[PDB]
Amino acid sequence: KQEAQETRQHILDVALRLFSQQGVSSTSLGEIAKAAGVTRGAIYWHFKDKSDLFSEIWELSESNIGELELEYQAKFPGDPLSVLREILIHVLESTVTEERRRLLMEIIFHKCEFVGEMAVVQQAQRNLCLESYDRIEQTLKHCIEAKMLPADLMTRRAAIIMRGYISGLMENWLFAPQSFDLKKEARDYVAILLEMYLLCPTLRNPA
Amino acid sequence: KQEAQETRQHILDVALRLFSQQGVSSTSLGEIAKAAGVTRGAIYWHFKDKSDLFSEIWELSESNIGELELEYQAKFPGDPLSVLREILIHVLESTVTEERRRLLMEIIFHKCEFVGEMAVVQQAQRNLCLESYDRIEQTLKHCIEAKMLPADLMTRRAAIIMRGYISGLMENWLFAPQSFDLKKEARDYVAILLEMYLLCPTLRNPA
Hints:
Chains A, B: Potential regulator protein for the acrAB genes. Chains A, B: Residues 5-65 form the HTH tetR-type domain. Chains A, B: Keywords: DNA-binding, Repressor, Transcription, Transcription regulation. Chains A, B: GO terms for molecular function: DNA-binding transcription factor activity; sequence-specific DNA binding; toxic substance binding; transcription cis-regulatory region binding. The structure is a homodimer. Chain A has helices at residues 4-21, 29-36, 40-46, 51-59, 69-72, 81-97, 99-110, 120-145, 157-175, 182-199. Helices cover 67% and strands 0% of the residues of chain A. The longest helix of chain A has 26 residues, at 120-145. Chains A and B meet through helix 8, helix 9 and helix 10 of A and helix 8, helix 9 and helix 10 of B.
């Protein structure tokens, strides 16, 4: 038993393959179960609906992303900026190398219409993103106390931009992965953003 | 006659209202015709399919955006950077003020699945975006000859970032228009990007 945990991820797996083939709107828990080899009744057992199953793919892919950090932070102990550095290098380059996030993120951006009850997973993310604005603000406030970024840095915008710069490059590369290379140009792109924090005026307003 | 041009845009009109209500995937030319008060045979008259009708809403909304320019350029004659300036100020703030682009852009980003024959309008945009990478590169090369930006500016990355920064903020504000204010914070946000062109190293590689 708990070979159901073998089966539980199996439904998540075959959802990605399908949500990439056709999108979320053109897919019911019907063809997922039919593809999972498990009954249409056994699928409505793990999950309530399509919303909190697709919320599951967003959730169960536990935010590693943000669970390396403390172990990235082990390598660079008292340097906060060098961790805000390599965490973003990771989020960009994992969209290239890691399949279980390659497709996952392509669906979030390009293969899911945020309407058909999918408007409620929009709020479950609208709110999750708002915590992110100030899971970053604090990392920046930390950076200002090790003094690696300016004292008068506009921290919310330094975060709204971060989000808008990082995922904007993600959205654009997922639409056309042929147009540019994210696995190579990332180190620079992210260093551009940290230099944007360091050198750019208009991200200040003194005293 | 040409009161068909009254009716032609009428089909485009009621498409926006519907594509915002439900998405593009859950909408046929059937309920657009039904809603246009025109026959389902008369809708398949102006338009071949859903692809080149949704390409039409993208196309017929002729790229003003980029047709102010030469008349924005009339105000600022020999200054290339002050035009690259106010054109982006317009693309951001019109996502707020103008409804016939408010909805249009929310669909492009959040309410359209790029799969079911919508994968072909993806290439029609993948290619349209690639011309945009170097409709900007030239505006930047121009800026380097009035000398308003650095001589060693990486022009492709100055354009890939531009696209990824400008539309990234668009994508993010359309998902949660409550999280920040684009009609006010834009002037600065865009000035940040132009200061990124001016001040930021790693966007260079000398000689």
